């Protein structure tokens, strides 16, 4: 992430993560709002980071 | 569905002599691609009285064929696209004889 | 007072590529020939030693033309239809274009 | 949530290799080691075994 | 005998102003016999040349040697008898011509082989040629 | 085969070089290991660490690559889906966690 | 009409099940690469192709169930001898036929505490014997895992009764209907290393030029100091032995060139259908279509 220009890295770490469709709930059937969105098949990424190695939330 | 093989009121092959040049016509082949556009081409220039053998898609995503065939005197384009399509068919035929025994080498 | 409408991202590449490969083989050739119009003109290399016919890429320049121009440039040379001459500069050709 | 059938890249069937493989990184294996014992060679596949999520347990769990 | 000239050259500057491509060089000739100034481009690919060699060239307007004056195109041909005995030719156009050379020097004569450029500078013996119409076919041979 | 292809103007203006060293980490990940018979157990010298502000070096990512049997450079030759010839360019290949956005249109 | 004919040949290396390489020469590029386009989207396999869910009562849902029952691998040996659905005319009854459209029936229930999985096993087929779920992937192979593809899992009051129905398709309609998991060839090369310059240079630089290739191509002969090509058929085309070769000046050592002919197949499967049965079958497809597109009728 020390790589990017900082513009690309605001970007990604301020709109583009809270928009990614993926994950939603683990009990959808109580979750009554308007437009729950969710994948078939989420995945990890192949590589590591420190922080999502001791968080440990995929 | 309707993007497979054409339906009643259409040729397959839809042939057009060339006004402008003589020995020149432009073969529009509805319902292929690449695969038999090229190996068609490919036949067509190991011929002697040929001169120019190419294809190409007029849109991408509209899936069909125009082949052209400039070829000198003594020939057509028929003749040189008949020539094409029998003498390919011949090497899948002798392909075919070709593997089916080298299949028998696994002797069980 | 320009032009509106001048070559983009990919093609301006494709001409680049195109200039540093300056002969192109029989296939290829009539290949491109397909799209533009003017059928094909004769082979600027006819025959060599080793390989059959040679086209350079202003031959293949010729396809985009309208019929029976004559015009004259900084570096282009238009007489009936067919580029003559085309100066070498890579760095002013999307001037030259 | 459940393992893909076919590889989403090449084609090749990966639905019945997920059980092998997690007993075969129970046992002492390292992942490369499980990879080229359970016979995928090409690393399309080898991307579709070792990132998957499976969440299929968290919703067993949370029904009732 | 279907050839407007013919003679033989040597070289003895390659590379003249720059070096414009990979594989086309400009190579400057100089005659006997004839005595004349020679500037042309070659691919250097299929035919390169040294420094100081020796080159026999010709131009004939049409390559089958029958005086039947059609452009042919069947090079590759079995055997139909063209000109052949050559060994690099190059189709071109010749597109100013400067036989008035209203000056000191001999005439200029340029052709273009559709992007290739040619320099032959000389007024005695050359009257054959016209401005346009391209039939010249530029053979080489040693 | 690629499952997304992307144009190459798009990257010595943005200035991300990150895009195409994650690329190549995870392409240095999941690929096996050869000459693994004997001397070691040859997957414990893995990196798979992209840490942001510590970082794994060019010369880990290359020598990692040139472990794996590709090409140090990251490129990869490929065949024509049409022609089915040598295309003469090498081609940068290698997987990237993408996104997919809401607002679908 | 003269002869304008190029005699192929084959050579196998390597075949089994679902495996095969052969040694394919004299023949163009365009003819393999339209065998291998042909093996991967026109050569017809028989899948599962409509659903009907009665009890749906699992934490899956019912477009995720029918996705996965898609892409489950049937073995497909009469299907160049059935007809496509649409050609029919009977079986306009959304059910069972015998040239089209073999009917499934699947039905699943727990009621221990002990997390019942249903598998691909529990596909019982009617048309028997003919059109089953896969099993090479459990028996007759002991490759992985026999209990096969997992569809769901359940608790006590949850259930699944469906049936589905197969038909006929190809692999440009969708992917589920195409059989080969992989199909590529390459061509093989032609090294033609010097003597007259390797001896030159010095046995440092000898083992470093063969360090720098990232498959083991050349082999380091130390007892007569020489070098020496083991294996053409790993080379990869990324030049780098002759760009340190140019980087360490010494021009004319080797040269590399792809040869015309002698494309190494290398065909895989989903064992839906055998390796060789999939290259006779894409030699028959050809035939059909070159044979749907002459002009014969009308020579003039
Ligand atoms: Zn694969
Ligand atoms: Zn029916």
């Known amino acids: ?58 | ?108 | 007072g320009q032009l509106i409408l001048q070559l983009g991202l990919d093609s301006l590449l494709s001409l680049r590529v195109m200039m540093e490969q300056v002969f192109l083989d029989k296939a290829s050739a009539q290949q491109l020939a397909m799209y533009g119009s003017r059928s094909l003109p004769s082979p600027a290399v006819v025959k060599s030693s080793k390989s059959g016919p040679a086209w350079t890429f202003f031959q293949i320049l010729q396809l985009a033309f309208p019929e029976r121009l004559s015009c004259r440039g900084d570096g282009f040379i238009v007489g009936g239809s067919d580029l003559l001459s085309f100066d070498f500069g890579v760095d002013a050709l999307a001037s030259i274009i | 949530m459940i393992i893909p059938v076919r590889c989403f890249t090449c084609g090749k069937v990966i639905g019945n290799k997920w059980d092998t493989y997690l007993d075969l990184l129970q046992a002492d294996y390292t992942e490369g080691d499980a990879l080229d014992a359970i016979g995928l060679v090409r690393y399309c596949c080898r991307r579709m075994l070792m990132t998957h999520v499976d969440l299929i347990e968290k919703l067993l769990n949370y029904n009732t | 005998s279907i050839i407007m000239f013919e003679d033989i050259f040597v070289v003895d500057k390659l590379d003249p102003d720059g070096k414009k491509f990979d594989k086309v060089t400009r190579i400057e000739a100089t005659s006997h016999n004839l005595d004349m100034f020679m500037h042309l481009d070659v691919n250097t690919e299929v035919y390169p040349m040294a420094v100081g060699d020796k080159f026999t060239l010709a131009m004939a307007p049409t390559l089958n040697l029958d005086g039947t004056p059609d452009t042919g195109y069947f090079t590759p041909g079995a055997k139909k008898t063209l000109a052949d005995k050559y060994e690099y030719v190059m189709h071109g156009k010749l597109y100013k011509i400067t036989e008035r050379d209203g000056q000191t020097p001999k005439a200029e004569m340029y052709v273009s082989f559709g992007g290739l450029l040619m320099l032959l500078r000389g007024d005695p013996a050359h009257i054959s040629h016209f401005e346009l119409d391209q039939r010249l076919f530029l053979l080489m041979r040693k | ?105 | 009409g003269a002869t304008y004919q190029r005699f192929p040949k084959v050579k196998i290396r390597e075949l089994k099940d679902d495996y095969a390489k052969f040694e394919l020469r004299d023949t163009d590029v365009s003819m393999a690469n339209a065998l291998r386009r042909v093996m991967i989207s026109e050569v017809p396999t028989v899948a599962i192709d409509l659903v009907e869910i009665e009890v749906n009562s699992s934490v899956l849902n019912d477009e995720f169930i029918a996705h996965r029952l898609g892409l489950i691998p049937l073995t497909s040996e009469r299907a160049m001898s059935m007809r496509f659905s649409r050609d029919c005319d009977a079986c306009d009854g959304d059910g069972q036929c015998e040239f089209c459209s073999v009917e499934f029936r699947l039905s699943a229930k727990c009621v221990t505490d002990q997390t019942l999985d249903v598998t691909s096993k529990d596909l019982y087929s009617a048309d028997p014997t003919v059109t089953p779920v896969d099993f090479g992937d459990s028996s007759g192979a002991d490759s992985s895992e026999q209990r096969g593809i997992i569809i769901v899992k359940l608790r006590r009051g949850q259930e699944l009764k469906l049936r589905a129905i197969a038909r006929k398709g190809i692999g440009k309609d969708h992917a589920k209907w195409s059989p080969a998991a992989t199909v590529t060839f390459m061509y093989e090369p032609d090294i033609i290393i010097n003597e007259d310059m390797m001896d030159t240079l010095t046995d440092d630089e000898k083992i470093d030029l063969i360090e720098s290739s990232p498959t083991k191509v050349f082999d380091f002969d130390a007892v007569t100091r020489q070098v020496v090509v083991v294996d053409p058929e790993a080379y990869t085309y990324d030049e780098e032995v002759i760009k340190k070769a140019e980087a360490m000046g010494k021009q004319g050592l080797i040269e590399i060139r792809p040869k015309d002919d002698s494309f190494i197949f290398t065909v895989e499967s989903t064992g839906a259908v055998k390796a060789s049965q999939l290259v006779l079958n894409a030699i028959d497809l050809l035939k059909q279509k070159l044979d749907a597109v002459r002009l014969s009728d009308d020579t003039v």
């Open chain 1, 1 to 58: 992430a020390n790589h990017d220009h900082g513009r690309r890295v605001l970007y990604q770490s301020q709109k583009h993560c809270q928009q990614a469709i993926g994950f939603c709930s683990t009990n959808p059937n109580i979750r009554c709002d308007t437009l729950s969105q969710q994948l078939f098949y989420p995945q990890r990424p192949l590589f590591k980071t420190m922080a999502s190695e001791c968080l440990q939330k995929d």
């Open chain 2, 1 to 108: 569905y309707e993007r497979f093989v054409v339906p009643e009121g259409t040729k397959k092959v839809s042939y057009e002599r060339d006004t402008k040049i003589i020995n020149a016509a432009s073969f529009t082949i509805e319902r292929e691609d690449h695969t038999i556009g090229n190996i068609v081409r490919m036949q067509l220039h190991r011929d002697e009285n040929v001169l120019f053998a190419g294809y190409q898609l007029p849109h991408p995503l509209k899936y069909k064929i125009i082949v052209r065939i400039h070829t000198t005197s003594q020939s057509s384009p028929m003749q040189a696209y008949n020539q094409a399509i029998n003498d390919l068919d011949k090497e899948l035929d002798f392909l075919k004889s070709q593997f089916e025994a080298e299949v028998a080498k696994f002797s069980n």
């Open chain 6, 1 to 105: 085969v690629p499952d997304i292809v992307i144009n190459p103007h798009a990257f010595p203006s943005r200035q991300t070089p990150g895009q195409l060293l994650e690329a190549a980490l995870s392409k240095g990940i999941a690929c096996p290991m050869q000459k693994k018979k004997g001397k070691s157990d040859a997957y414990s010298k893995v990196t798979r660490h992209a840490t942001p502000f510590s970082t794994p070096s060019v010369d880990d990512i290359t020598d990692q690559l040139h472990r794996a049997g590709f090409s140090r450079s990251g490129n990869e030759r490929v065949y024509n889906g049409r022609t089915g010839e040598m295309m003469r360019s090498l081609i940068f290949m290698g997987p990237n966690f993408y996104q997919r956005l809401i607002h679908m249109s």
